Amino acid sequence: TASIAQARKLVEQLKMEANIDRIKVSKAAADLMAYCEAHAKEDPLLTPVPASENPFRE
Amino acid sequence: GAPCHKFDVKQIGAQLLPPLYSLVFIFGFVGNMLVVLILINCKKLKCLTDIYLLNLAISDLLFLITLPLWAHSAANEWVFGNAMCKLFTGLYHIGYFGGIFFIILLTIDRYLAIVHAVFALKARTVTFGVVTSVITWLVAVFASVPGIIFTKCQKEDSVYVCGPYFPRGWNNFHTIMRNILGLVLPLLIMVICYSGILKTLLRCRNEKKRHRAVRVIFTIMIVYFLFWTPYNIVILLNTFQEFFGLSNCESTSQLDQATQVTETLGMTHCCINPIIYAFVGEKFRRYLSVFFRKH
Amino acid sequence: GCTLSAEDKAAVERSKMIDRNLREDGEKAAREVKLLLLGAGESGKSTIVKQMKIITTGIVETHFTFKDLHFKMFDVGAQRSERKKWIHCFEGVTAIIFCVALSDYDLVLAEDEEMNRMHESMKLFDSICNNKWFTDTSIILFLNKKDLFEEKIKKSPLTICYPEYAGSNTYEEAAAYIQCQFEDLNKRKDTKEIYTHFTCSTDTKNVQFVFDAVTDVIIKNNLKDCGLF
Amino acid sequence: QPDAINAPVTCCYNFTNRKISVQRLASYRRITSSKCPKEAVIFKTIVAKEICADPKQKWVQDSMDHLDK
Amino acid sequence: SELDQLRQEAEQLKNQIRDARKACADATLSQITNNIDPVGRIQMRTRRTLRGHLAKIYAMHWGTDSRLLVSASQDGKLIIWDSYTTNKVHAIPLRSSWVMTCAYAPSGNYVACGGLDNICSIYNLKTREGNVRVSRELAGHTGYLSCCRFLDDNQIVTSSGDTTCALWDIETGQQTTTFTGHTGDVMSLSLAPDTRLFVSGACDASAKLWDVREGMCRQTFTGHESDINAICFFPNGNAFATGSDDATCRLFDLRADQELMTYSHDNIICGITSVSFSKSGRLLLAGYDDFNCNVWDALKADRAGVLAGHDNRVSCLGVTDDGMAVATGSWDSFLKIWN
Amino acid sequence: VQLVESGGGLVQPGGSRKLSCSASGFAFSSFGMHWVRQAPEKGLEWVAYISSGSGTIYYADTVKGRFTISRDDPKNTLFLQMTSLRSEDTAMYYCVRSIYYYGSSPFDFWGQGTTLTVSDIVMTQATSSVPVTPGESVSISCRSSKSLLHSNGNTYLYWFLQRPGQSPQLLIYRMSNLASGVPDRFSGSGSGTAFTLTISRLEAEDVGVYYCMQHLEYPLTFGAGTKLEL
CATH class of the missing domain: 2.60.40.10 (Immunoglobulins)
Incomplete structure (x- = not known):
């Protein structure tokens, strides 16, 4: 009864999820590589910061 | 022809006393230093028992620091410091009375926690512990003051000695006060507190933990009696020396050697105190394990 | 404080005021005794909640006092979503009061008729008692509705709930066997003491039993703190 | 302090001694140690024998005066 | 009998989705990023330690100025810290001590909290009186509240253990949108930078991407043996990381609907409580249950470094918006700031 | 309040x-x-x-x-x-x-x-009377005797308005912030020793005596005050 309608909503949700324009994995890998390489200068946790610029000191 | 006491006893004491003092210093220093480091690393403020154990360890360290110095002093050669003598004597007495009074405080704390748990929850506070510790150190220093006042450095027969020079009445009084403070009062507190503690422990269902606790309590009482009591008895006998047993030339030398051995025994009890209090405890063992895993 | 400005020093003073308030509130909170109330839905725990109280969904807190000792009882019955993802919050509690009824054996479970209710309470007790978070936490077990159990036990034998049971139909023997099975469920006999009581009409007796069990737990905790064990 | 170090080198348990002539007194070493039951006079004789003397007697006082001067 | 045919249809649709994901799987991320030089040994250092909590600390959130910290504990108090001076700015008493989440407003005017009381309480910090006051109590969830996040001042995304997720309006006090479809308790929320999407991690080992404006589930992710404890968005918004009780972190692609990468080690067997990223996105920071945090190279899966110094279970990891520092809270009642 | x-x-x-x-x-x-x-x-x-x-x-x-x-x-x-x-x-x-x-x-x-x-840091605030027609922006200058820029980057400057017949109302605190309940017309800036209060679109409510206050160190000192007539 109610579980039949719930399974119908689950099948409708899977039907909506199936029709998506997914893309190649290599393009997203290149995009993540480009974003990590492009912003390396703005990462204080990866590039060390001099003590005059670092507000956390002993 | 009056000379009875001679250098032969001094020869035996000089030969055997410094290595014995050195062994006591090594074992005591290692154990007490380890206990102090663990307590500093741990949250001493949270537990009242930790505060009193730390004060006991500090009293033990203050007692033990002067042992190489007295070991050198055993050779009968004394450094030319009068204030140095009055400082080493003060450190020795402050460490001794600190050890006795903080053992009494640990006993009273265990009685208060076990017998009256509900009252202990409201009553036990960090502020109360700090106030009691400061007052206890003041009482220990004030008790050590009469020893310090008469302590002097004098040269007899071209030999320097750091020694006490009590008057007639004060010397008799000091032995009685030493006996009352170190033997009668702590044993009385231990028997009165531990009887109630054992009576409360009887209610506990678990057999193995109950028997281990009973063995530990009896071990503490028997260890305190066996170490401290002969020393106090020999001190009382030597101080009186007329009413109890005649001042026989042969007997007094044996009393002096017994005084040396019982002195070593009472000093050894200070070394065995950190094991008996800290190491027996499972909580301290867990702290030790965490300290070794972290470091 | 020389490098700090006036507003910085006043901020430090405000922080010290906040620190003293936090310390005083923690000292007040540490003295209070926390009790976690568990059991099945049909266990009749509401009856004892009514009894302790004299002397919207979520955690139901019950504050009361007895012999100048403050008890906070936490009821988690309202939320049936999960038991594994929040019970670690209750790790630091003095005792767990676990309540089951003795008239549950004749009544089958509503969700599944095949499964009995007392066996579900036993699986609940086994999961809570053998949990890794509560290895040192004591359990105060309450057996409710003893009069209804007497009225049911005279009409029907205990053989329905226990297949492998040979014993006299006496009320005391049946209650003792149920208590023995619940105690036998415990797998930590050297760290965890289980206290069992039969609920009575008198309000004072149940509270006195809880007070005695809490006193035993506090004495064991103090003995552990001192280092005698 | 340790009592072991504080052991007195010389003490006077008892005296059966009698009066000593002024010429027989080679040396004088007063002892007032707190660990002995009485204060005492160590009359060191010429034969290197130490004789205990009670300091309250009259001839012992005269001998202490004469040796002092 | 229609249920069995409809289940078979659902199985056919799932087979279609698996075949599409397999067809798109041209290459592996680890195969591509081998040319990139490694980050080397990242040795971070404790610079500030925050003290004053007494019970277990469960949650922390950074402000947008990278200086203020909200911290939540079982003491029943929220503490607002100044990170540069270690001073306490606020101490807020709570009506219930069973608080498991906290959030700080992007404007900085409000702080929300919640937990086992099933009520989300929102506190006004800026008042013409010197007391932080309860602005609004939100109710309607039946399960325990796991995570709360602010889209803005007037809207809250709140997830709980009743398997649902609610968007809330403070002024009305009524939930506007209810997100449903999870089959297990929801543990964590990660909010997108553009505040148009959020991803929900639940016990049923599925991470779902939700559209906040439309109100419908648009994407579903799988591949975890155990429950999803913590989830964090990548800075661009096209990927996210997922932590679990399987001692594995997984980097998932939002656009291709595929598991990009798995971070795992043989010796590490304990669960994961918090997941966070650096500002660039090269370092993934995860707090485990063997009492330490690991910094992972995001694009090469190597362990870049180990942060340690807590004595109990690490519970929460914040990274500042400007990327200067990492704050770590745990069950030893301490907060440590790392650089 | x-x-x-x-x-x-x-x-x-x-x-x-x-x-x-x-x-x-x-x-x-x-x-x-x-x-x-x-x-x-x-x-x-x-x-x-x-x-x-x-x-x-x-x-x-x-x-x-x-x-x-x-x-x-x-x-x-x-x-x-x-x-x-x-x-x-x-x-x-x-x-x-x-x-x-x-x-x-x-x-x-x-x-x-x-x-x-x-019956002490000295704050200089020169131009006592300012005769400007309403609807035009006005500048108010407050010179300090020493730099108020502290090592933490905060400059401790306060701007008050006392309109006739009322209490002094706070306008500007620390020169980069606007007080709550104050319109955005008021603004301010400074270099650490010379300070500027800028008031745009003068209304009848803005008639009063403006004041300059130093909070760097005690005792707290005030300016002489500029009077605005409209």
Whole structure:
């Protein structure tokens, strides 16, 4: 009864999820590589910061 | 022809006393230093028992620091410091009375926690512990003051000695006060507190933990009696020396050697105190394990 | 404080005021005794909640006092979503009061008729008692509705709930066997003491039993703190 | 302090001694140690024998005066 | 009998989705990023330690100025810290001590909290009186509240253990949108930078991407043996990381609907409580249950470094918006700031 | 939010007078408190400060040894006890509320003040009278005797408005912030020694005497004051 309608909503949700324009994995890998390489200068946790610029000191 | 006491006893004491003092210093220093480091690393403020154990360890360290110095002093050669003598004597007495009074405080704390748990929850506070510790150190220093006042450095027969020079009445009084403070009062507190503690422990269902606790309590009482009591008895006998047993030339030398051995025994009890209090405890063992895993 | 400005020093003073308030509130909170109330839905725990109280969904807190000792009882019955993802919050509690009824054996479970209710309470007790978070936490077990159990036990034998049971139909023997099975469920006999009581009409007796069990737990905790064990 | 170090080198348990002539007194070493039951006079004789003397007697006082001067 | 045919249809649709994901799987991320030089040994250092909590600390959130910290504990108090001076700015008493989440407003005017009381309480910090006051109590969830996040001042995304997720309006006090479809308790929320999407991690080992404006589930992710404890968005918004009780972190692609990468080690067997990223996105920071945090190279899966110094279970990891520092809270009642 | 000062009146010189301020509508125990005095024609003068926990107390150099400040938290009152009064003490007495933490705004609320009649960093504020037609932006300059830029990057400058017949209202705190309830027309800037208050689109409500205040170190000092006529 109610579980039949719930399974119908689950099948409708899977039907909506199936029709998506997914893309190649290599393009997203290149995009993540480009974003990590492009912003390396703005990462204080990866590039060390001099003590005059670092507000956390002993 | 009056000379009875001679250098032969001094020869035996000089030969055997410094290595014995050195062994006591090594074992005591290692154990007490380890206990102090663990307590500093741990949250001493949270537990009242930790505060009193730390004060006991500090009293033990203050007692033990002067042992190489007295070991050198055993050779009968004394450094030319009068204030140095009055400082080493003060450190020795402050460490001794600190050890006795903080053992009494640990006993009273265990009685208060076990017998009256509900009252202990409201009553036990960090502020109360700090106030009691400061007052206890003041009482220990004030008790050590009469020893310090008469302590002097004098040269007899071209030999320097750091020694006490009590008057007639004060010397008799000091032995009685030493006996009352170190033997009668702590044993009385231990028997009165531990009887109630054992009576409360009887209610506990678990057999193995109950028997281990009973063995530990009896071990503490028997260890305190066996170490401290002969020393106090020999001190009382030597101080009186007329009413109890005649001042026989042969007997007094044996009393002096017994005084040396019982002195070593009472000093050894200070070394065995950190094991008996800290190491027996499972909580301290867990702290030790965490300290070794972290470091 | 020389490098700090006036507003910085006043901020430090405000922080010290906040620190003293936090310390005083923690000292007040540490003295209070926390009790976690568990059991099945049909266990009749509401009856004892009514009894302790004299002397919207979520955690139901019950504050009361007895012999100048403050008890906070936490009821988690309202939320049936999960038991594994929040019970670690209750790790630091003095005792767990676990309540089951003795008239549950004749009544089958509503969700599944095949499964009995007392066996579900036993699986609940086994999961809570053998949990890794509560290895040192004591359990105060309450057996409710003893009069209804007497009225049911005279009409029907205990053989329905226990297949492998040979014993006299006496009320005391049946209650003792149920208590023995619940105690036998415990797998930590050297760290965890289980206290069992039969609920009575008198309000004072149940509270006195809880007070005695809490006193035993506090004495064991103090003995552990001192280092005698 | 340790009592072991504080052991007195010389003490006077008892005296059966009698009066000593002024010429027989080679040396004088007063002892007032707190660990002995009485204060005492160590009359060191010429034969290197130490004789205990009670300091309250009259001839012992005269001998202490004469040796002092 | 229609249920069995409809289940078979659902199985056919799932087979279609698996075949599409397999067809798109041209290459592996680890195969591509081998040319990139490694980050080397990242040795971070404790610079500030925050003290004053007494019970277990469960949650922390950074402000947008990278200086203020909200911290939540079982003491029943929220503490607002100044990170540069270690001073306490606020101490807020709570009506219930069973608080498991906290959030700080992007404007900085409000702080929300919640937990086992099933009520989300929102506190006004800026008042013409010197007391932080309860602005609004939100109710309607039946399960325990796991995570709360602010889209803005007037809207809250709140997830709980009743398997649902609610968007809330403070002024009305009524939930506007209810997100449903999870089959297990929801543990964590990660909010997108553009505040148009959020991803929900639940016990049923599925991470779902939700559209906040439309109100419908648009994407579903799988591949975890155990429950999803913590989830964090990548800075661009096209990927996210997922932590679990399987001692594995997984980097998932939002656009291709595929598991990009798995971070795992043989010796590490304990669960994961918090997941966070650096500002660039090269370092993934995860707090485990063997009492330490690991910094992972995001694009090469190597362990870049180990942060340690807590004595109990690490519970929460914040990274500042400007990327200067990492704050770590745990069950030893301490907060440590790392650089 | 309300502060009601009582007492005042005519006191013979050498007498003792007690001022009581009643605080209503806010959590009095969390705020620090100040006393400020205004002469009939002269500028504002700082008198005394008491902390929220009554832990630290500061007095002005002129009022040391004569004025005693007291804070009664369960009755929400401030008491200022005055002895050895003299002619200079004749003034209007304002109670000032203040709050101190990161991001706060002290000097936010001012009392009505009582009239008592008896029978250091120097802030330069030159241009007393400014004759500008309304509808045109006006600049107000406040020169300081030393740099107010602290090592933590905060510059401790305060801009107040006292319109005729009312208490001084806070306008600008720390020169980069706008007080709550104040329109965005007011703004300010500075270099660390020279400071500028910029007021655009002058309305009839903006008629009053503007004041410049230094909070870097005690005693707190005020400017002479610029008068705006419209």
